Design a protein around this ligand. Structure first.
Ligand SMILES: [Mn+2]
Length: 281
């Protein structure tokens, strides 16, 4: 095609806040493209090396009653919560695994229409509430784009609610590359899922309304070729022809506790790579 390799090297982990406070929380989020495939691909061994405090997973494709038994070889993340489509089938699904149990775990966004596909887990902790999300793809041919706009609004209002109570951290596959810098080929994707003006706009609305800051882009406003997903086809990863779909968005109040927002480009196991957040809470 038009694209050859574009180099990207994630900078070293900055593990102290701007006030010099060492990070006390490490959160890892990962679209795993199937819990069972991911595990087969050694996803868990990378999790152990990373040693996060909280691990959030998206697209587990796994019924909450058919969890791989390997998920018990994680003694460090022993508190495990799962949401999968209410029809009990093998698609979508998210996970949240935690060293410490949260004060409370909830599922969905309190909207029946939007709560049947196991897309959202809310884990409330002392100083903050963590949400992980697997946002509805707009669909091939954009046949799900109208629903996705419904989804975007409900979700945006629900999050706005949470944040009014506690500092918010939202992470996961938000199924949109916000701006042109967020994907390798903006020009050819303006009509495809992930880069419609509708989706880009909803991400923008999400940021101002809650409000939320894009942790990675706040720290690296001018850094290009930083992606978290590459299609399996066309040898895309190897050419770094990708999209940034995975994010950590923070309440502005958490910005002084932001140490770094990382993209683990080399970590294999899915068509997305892990992202990792360091906070000094
Ligand atoms: Mn997938």
């Amino acid at each position: 095609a038009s694209e050859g390799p574009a180099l990207y090297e994630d900078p070293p982990d900055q593990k102290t806040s701007p006030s010099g406070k060492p990070a006390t929380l490490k959160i890892c989020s990962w679209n795993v493209d199937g819990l069972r495939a991911w595990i087969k691909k050694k996803g868990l061994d990378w999790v152990k090396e990373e040693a996060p405090d909280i691990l959030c997973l998206q697209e587990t494709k796994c019924s909450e009653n058919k969890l791989p038994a390997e998920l018990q070889e994680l003694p460090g993340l022993s508190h495990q919560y799962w949401s999968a489509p209410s029809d009990k089938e093998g698609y979508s699904g998210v996970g949240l695994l935690s060293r410490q149990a949260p004060l409370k775990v909830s599922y969905g966004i309190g909207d029946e229409e939007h709560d049947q596909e196991g897309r959202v887990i809310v884990a409330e902790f002392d100083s903050f509430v963590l949400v992980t999300a697997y946002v509805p793809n707009a669909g091939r041919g954009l046949v799900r784009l109208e629903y996705r706009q419904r989804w975007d609004e409900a979700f945006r209002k629900f999050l706005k609610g949470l944040a009014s109570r506690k500092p918010l951290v939202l992470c996961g596959d938000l199924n949109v590359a916000h701006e042109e810098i967020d994907l390798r080929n903006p020009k050819g994707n303006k009509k495809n899922a992930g880069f419609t003006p509708q989706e880009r706009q909803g991400f923008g609305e999400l940021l101002q309304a809650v409000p939320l800051a894009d942790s990675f882009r706040h720290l690296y406003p001018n850094t290009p070729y930083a992606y978290t997903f590459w299609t399996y086809m066309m040898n895309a990863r190897s050419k770094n022809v990708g999209w940034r779909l995975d994010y950590f968005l923070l309440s502005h109040s958490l910005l002084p506790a932001l140490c770094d927002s990382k993209i683990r480009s080399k970590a294999l196991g899915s068509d997305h790579c892990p992202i990792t957040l360091y906070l000094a809470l």
